[PDB]
Design a protein around this motif. Structure first.
Motif, PDB file in Angstrom:
ATOM      1  N   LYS B  19     -18.833 -35.109  51.150  1.00 24.71           N
ATOM      2  CA  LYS B  19     -17.583 -34.724  50.505  1.00 24.71           C
ATOM      3  C   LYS B  19     -16.981 -33.431  51.049  1.00 24.71           C
ATOM      4  O   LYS B  19     -15.785 -33.196  50.846  1.00 24.71           O
ATOM      5  CB  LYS B  19     -17.801 -34.540  48.996  1.00 24.71           C
ATOM      6  CG  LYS B  19     -17.890 -35.807  48.140  1.00 24.71           C
ATOM      7  CD  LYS B  19     -16.547 -36.517  47.984  1.00 24.71           C
ATOM      8  CE  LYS B  19     -16.589 -37.510  46.821  1.00 24.71           C
ATOM      9  NZ  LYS B  19     -16.011 -38.829  47.181  1.00 24.71           N
ATOM     10  N   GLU B  22     -13.571 -33.261  52.791  1.00 22.74           N
ATOM     11  CA  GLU B  22     -12.407 -33.764  52.073  1.00 22.74           C
ATOM     12  C   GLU B  22     -11.896 -32.731  51.087  1.00 22.74           C
ATOM     13  O   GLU B  22     -10.690 -32.651  50.830  1.00 22.74           O
ATOM     14  CB  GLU B  22     -12.731 -35.050  51.316  1.00 22.74           C
ATOM     15  CG  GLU B  22     -12.773 -36.286  52.188  1.00 22.74           C
ATOM     16  CD  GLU B  22     -13.360 -37.510  51.502  1.00 22.74           C
ATOM     17  OE1 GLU B  22     -12.886 -38.619  51.823  1.00 22.74           O
ATOM     18  OE2 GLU B  22     -14.278 -37.382  50.660  1.00 22.74           O
ATOM     19  N   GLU B  23     -12.816 -31.950  50.522  1.00 22.40           N
ATOM     20  CA  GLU B  23     -12.465 -30.912  49.563  1.00 22.40           C
ATOM     21  C   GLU B  23     -11.642 -29.819  50.217  1.00 22.40           C
ATOM     22  O   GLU B  23     -10.639 -29.354  49.662  1.00 22.40           O
ATOM     23  CB  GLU B  23     -13.736 -30.293  48.995  1.00 22.40           C
ATOM     24  CG  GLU B  23     -14.501 -31.126  48.006  1.00 22.40           C
ATOM     25  CD  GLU B  23     -15.877 -30.550  47.736  1.00 22.40           C
ATOM     26  OE1 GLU B  23     -16.048 -29.899  46.687  1.00 22.40           O
ATOM     27  OE2 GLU B  23     -16.802 -30.797  48.537  1.00 22.40           O
ATOM     28  N   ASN B  25      -9.867 -30.107  52.789  1.00 27.68           N
ATOM     29  CA  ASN B  25      -8.570 -30.708  53.085  1.00 27.68           C
ATOM     30  C   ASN B  25      -7.651 -30.677  51.879  1.00 27.68           C
ATOM     31  O   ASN B  25      -6.430 -30.532  52.020  1.00 27.68           O
ATOM     32  CB  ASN B  25      -8.753 -32.159  53.527  1.00 27.68           C
ATOM     33  CG  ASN B  25      -9.377 -32.279  54.899  1.00 27.68           C
ATOM     34  OD1 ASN B  25      -9.798 -31.288  55.496  1.00 27.68           O
ATOM     35  ND2 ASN B  25      -9.441 -33.505  55.408  1.00 27.68           N
ATOM     36  N   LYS B  26      -8.208 -30.868  50.687  1.00 27.26           N
ATOM     37  CA  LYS B  26      -7.358 -30.868  49.510  1.00 27.26           C
ATOM     38  C   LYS B  26      -6.724 -29.497  49.315  1.00 27.26           C
ATOM     39  O   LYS B  26      -5.506 -29.400  49.154  1.00 27.26           O
ATOM     40  CB  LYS B  26      -8.151 -31.308  48.277  1.00 27.26           C
ATOM     41  CG  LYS B  26      -7.397 -32.348  47.444  1.00 27.26           C
ATOM     42  CD  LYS B  26      -8.052 -32.728  46.098  1.00 27.26           C
ATOM     43  CE  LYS B  26      -9.256 -33.663  46.131  1.00 27.26           C
ATOM     44  NZ  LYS B  26      -9.782 -33.853  44.727  1.00 27.26           N
ATOM     45  N   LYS B  27      -7.516 -28.423  49.412  1.00 25.34           N
ATOM     46  CA  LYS B  27      -6.974 -27.077  49.211  1.00 25.34           C
ATOM     47  C   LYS B  27      -5.985 -26.700  50.315  1.00 25.34           C
ATOM     48  O   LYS B  27      -4.968 -26.051  50.043  1.00 25.34           O
ATOM     49  CB  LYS B  27      -8.122 -26.062  49.108  1.00 25.34           C
ATOM     50  CG  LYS B  27      -7.751 -24.587  49.315  1.00 25.34           C
ATOM     51  CD  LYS B  27      -8.978 -23.717  49.051  1.00 25.34           C
ATOM     52  CE  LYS B  27      -9.871 -23.662  50.272  1.00 25.34           C
ATOM     53  NZ  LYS B  27     -10.848 -22.555  50.167  1.00 25.34           N
ATOM     54  N   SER B  28      -6.252 -27.108  51.562  1.00 25.18           N
ATOM     55  CA  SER B  28      -5.280 -26.895  52.636  1.00 25.18           C
ATOM     56  C   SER B  28      -3.976 -27.660  52.453  1.00 25.18           C
ATOM     57  O   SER B  28      -2.920 -27.163  52.861  1.00 25.18           O
ATOM     58  CB  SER B  28      -5.896 -27.192  54.014  1.00 25.18           C
ATOM     59  OG  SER B  28      -7.206 -26.667  54.175  1.00 25.18           O
ATOM     60  N   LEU B  29      -4.010 -28.847  51.857  1.00 24.24           N
ATOM     61  CA  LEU B  29      -2.781 -29.624  51.718  1.00 24.24           C
ATOM     62  C   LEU B  29      -1.738 -28.877  50.884  1.00 24.24           C
ATOM     63  O   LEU B  29      -0.562 -28.812  51.260  1.00 24.24           O
ATOM     64  CB  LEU B  29      -3.106 -30.981  51.107  1.00 24.24           C
ATOM     65  CG  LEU B  29      -1.933 -31.955  50.977  1.00 24.24           C
ATOM     66  CD1 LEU B  29      -1.308 -32.326  52.325  1.00 24.24           C
ATOM     67  CD2 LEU B  29      -2.377 -33.199  50.216  1.00 24.24           C
ATOM     68  N   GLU B  30      -2.148 -28.322  49.733  1.00 30.52           N
ATOM     69  CA  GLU B  30      -1.254 -27.476  48.932  1.00 30.52           C
ATOM     70  C   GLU B  30      -0.831 -26.223  49.678  1.00 30.52           C
ATOM     71  O   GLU B  30       0.195 -25.621  49.346  1.00 30.52           O
ATOM     72  CB  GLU B  30      -1.917 -27.016  47.629  1.00 30.52           C
ATOM     73  CG  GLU B  30      -2.105 -28.092  46.594  1.00 30.52           C
ATOM     74  CD  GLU B  30      -3.236 -28.973  46.970  1.00 30.52           C
ATOM     75  OE1 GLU B  30      -4.085 -28.489  47.734  1.00 30.52           O
ATOM     76  OE2 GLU B  30      -3.249 -30.142  46.556  1.00 30.52           O
ATOM     77  N   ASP B  33      -5.436 -20.954  48.921  1.00 28.44           N
ATOM     78  CA  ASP B  33      -6.360 -21.007  47.797  1.00 28.44           C
ATOM     79  C   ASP B  33      -5.636 -20.621  46.514  1.00 28.44           C
ATOM     80  O   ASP B  33      -6.034 -21.056  45.426  1.00 28.44           O
ATOM     81  CB  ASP B  33      -7.560 -20.142  48.233  1.00 28.44           C
ATOM     82  CG  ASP B  33      -7.398 -18.654  47.961  1.00 28.44           C
ATOM     83  OD1 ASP B  33      -8.106 -18.103  47.113  1.00 28.44           O
ATOM     84  OD2 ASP B  33      -6.325 -18.116  48.291  1.00 28.44           O
TER      85      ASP B  33
END
Lengths: 405, 89, 54, 54
Positions: B19, B22-23, B25-30, B33
């Motif tokens: 995982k 993918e995690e 990636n989620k914080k980078s998408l927005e 931090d």
């Protein structure tokens, strides 16, 4: 031991400046005398920390602020010299004794005792770090269980002594584990009074109430504040949690509270307030609500955090009991009841009713107060569904989570 | 730093090698931090988290206050001023 | 402290008085305990009429 | 002259009243407190006050 809980109280009044002027000045005088006798000078440095251009500061070793109302809290340099002198002598004399006691044989009694005496001195003068470290050795050494519980209450007293709630909390979990392991009834009573005052310091007054009524039945005057202070706390919490029926039976099944009768200004005010609620005549309640704020919550170390919370909660409670037994009231008869005026009342009510935590409505045309509190099965349903909504939710998340991994 | 009840998701999910990308990636998408951007962005550090005792650091429990104004000064003024009207009644 | 200077029937008086004090402090727990002790301490036969009346 | 009668005449008023009032109100619903105040032999306001406790 004894003088430490005295000083911390009186110092808490100087840290504030919302306290009566004669109370604050006399408090200054008691703490200064004890700097000479018990070396409370290192503790005097802690009081400046709590300020920095906030009131109750007139310090000479630090920054003197004459925009303040305290002026008797001088941190003189006569005090500060006295500290260095006393500090050095006592370390030199005590060290020399203890070295030679350790050398003579017997770890079980002698070496344990010698190190405990180190922690007693640093505990006494308000250095927490050095008491901690030396008393850690005492615990490790082969000693009875009663001795460990004793030393743990002594460390935890220093957290009360600095009036930092954070330090206390951890240490009282340590006794809470070790009290079942000791199986000692002697210090079990000591645990109850410490832990009562800790629930009192946090917003758990359901737990504090049970402890502080037990403190009447057995009090312990070693390292613990006055019997009149323990009586006052029991009354405060009893009113908070318990309504008429429960409250009346508590102070009628409490003979110990009664023998103490009200012998100090803090104790009057709470004791008179008790009578008026459960007697169903709140005529005197509203002036006494002020007095109890003034003489209990503000001076105490453990209720000043809750000073504002207390009066918010109690204002609901007293009104609720009248609204329960009355299907209808007139605003005027209800205004007379407390000893308030009509318009003043609506304001207090206007806060409680939207959270819907008091369940009433007010016809301002007719002037009456209707009570829409369900006293039937509708009430039980209002309990049930919010628990079952949560039940649903709790299973949805735990179940879904294990399937995925 | 944990969203709702801190322990409820700390036990709910924990790290895996699988995982971990993918995690991130989620914080980078927005795009950030979003807790260390904010002090620079305002050009200050907290003083308005010092609004109430509970706000600063949660070392108490909730009161359901949100302004923490002493209510003793207003209740005292009502008490005395009402008595006088009755005295002059 | 008068159990080391003790032979006297004079502690019967003190127990009964003690219960009366406790009654008017409004603590009946040890008012009752001390009354029993006064009764038992008067179960031996030497006691004045006033003493029993009390 | 007696503290003790002042105590227990408080008690005496509560019980004599409670028996009296239950009987008056037994077959009644929506009975005026003005009607009760005559028969019971007490003031209109006192009736209201007793009922609240109960």
């Amino acid at each position: 031991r004894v003088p430490n809980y005295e000083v911390s109280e009186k110092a808490f009044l100087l840290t504030q400046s919302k306290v009566s002027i004669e109370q604050r000045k006399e408090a200054a005088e008691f703490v200064l005398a004890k700097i000479k006798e018990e070396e409370m000078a290192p503790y005097y440095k802690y009081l400046c920390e709590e300020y920095l251009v906030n009131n109750g500061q007139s310090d000479l070793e630090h920054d003197e602020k004459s925009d303040s109302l305290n002026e008797w809290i001088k941190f003189d340099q006569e005090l500060y010299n006295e500290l260095c002198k006393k500090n050095e002598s006592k370390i030199k004399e005590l060290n020399e004794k203890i070295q030679k006691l350790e050398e003579d044989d017997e770890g079980e009694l002698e070496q344990a005792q010698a190190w405990i005496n180190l922690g007693e001195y640093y505990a006494q003068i308000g250095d927490k770090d050095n008491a901690e470290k030396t008393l850690g050795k005492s615990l490790s050494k082969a000693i009875s269980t009663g001795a460990k519980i004793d030393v743990m209450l002594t460390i935890a007293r220093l957290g009360f002594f600095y009036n930092d709630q954070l330090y206390v909390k951890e240490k009282l979990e340590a006794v809470n584990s070790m009290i079942e392991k000791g199986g000692d009834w002697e210090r079990r009573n000591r645990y109850k009074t410490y832990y009562g005052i800790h629930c009192l310091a946090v917003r758990n007054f359901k737990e504090a109430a049970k402890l502080l009524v037990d403190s009447l039945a057995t009090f312990t005057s070693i390292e613990l504040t006055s019997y009149e202070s323990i009586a006052t706390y029991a009354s405060v919490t009893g009113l908070f949690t318990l309504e008429r029926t429960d409250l009346k039976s508590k102070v009628i099944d409490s003979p110990e509270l009664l023998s103490l009768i009200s012998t100090t200004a803090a104790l009057q005010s709470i004791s008179s307030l008790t009578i008026s609620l459960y007697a169903s005549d709140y005529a005197s309640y509203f002036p006494y609500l002020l007095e109890t704020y003034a003489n209990v919550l503000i001076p105490c170390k453990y209720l000043n955090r809750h000073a504002d919370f207390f009066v918010r909660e109690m204002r609901r409670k007293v009104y609720a009991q009248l609204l329960e037994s009355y299907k209808t009231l007139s605003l005027k008869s209800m205004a007379s009841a407390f000893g308030v005026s009509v318009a003043f009342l609506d304001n207090d009510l206007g806060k409680f009713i939207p959270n819907k935590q008091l369940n009433c409505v007010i016809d301002r045309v007719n002037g009456i107060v209707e009570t829409n509190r369900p006293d039937n099965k509708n009430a039980q349903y209002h309990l049930l569904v919010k628990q079952g909504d949560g039940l649903l939710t709790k299973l949805q998340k735990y179940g879904a989570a294990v399937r995925l991994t | 730093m944990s969203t709702d009840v801190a322990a409820a998701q700390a036990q709910s999910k924990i790290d895996l090698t699988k995982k971990k990308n993918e995690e991130i990636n989620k914080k980078s998408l927005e795009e950030d931090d979003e807790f260390e951007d904010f002090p620079i962005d305002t050009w200050a550090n907290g003083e308005t988290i010092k609004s109430n005792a509970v706000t600063q650091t949660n070392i108490w429990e909730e009161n359901w206050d949100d302004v923490e104004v002493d209510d003793d000064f207003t209740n005292e003024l009502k008490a005395e001023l009402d008595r006088y009207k009755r005295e002059n009644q | 402290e008068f159990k080391k200077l003790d032979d006297k029937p004079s502690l019967v008086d003190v127990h009964l008085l003690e219960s009366k004090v406790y009654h008017k402090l409004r603590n009946l727990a040890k008012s009752k305990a001390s009354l029993t002790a006064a009764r038992t301490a008067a179960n031996s036969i030497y006691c004045p009429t006033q003493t029993v009346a009390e | 002259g007696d503290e003790l009668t002042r105590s227990h005449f408080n008690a005496l008023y509560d019980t004599l009243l409670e028996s009296n009032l239950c009987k008056i109100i037994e077959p009644f619903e929506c009975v005026e407190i003005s009607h009760i105040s005559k028969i019971i032999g007490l003031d209109t306001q006192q009736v209201e006050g007793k009922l609240s406790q109960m």
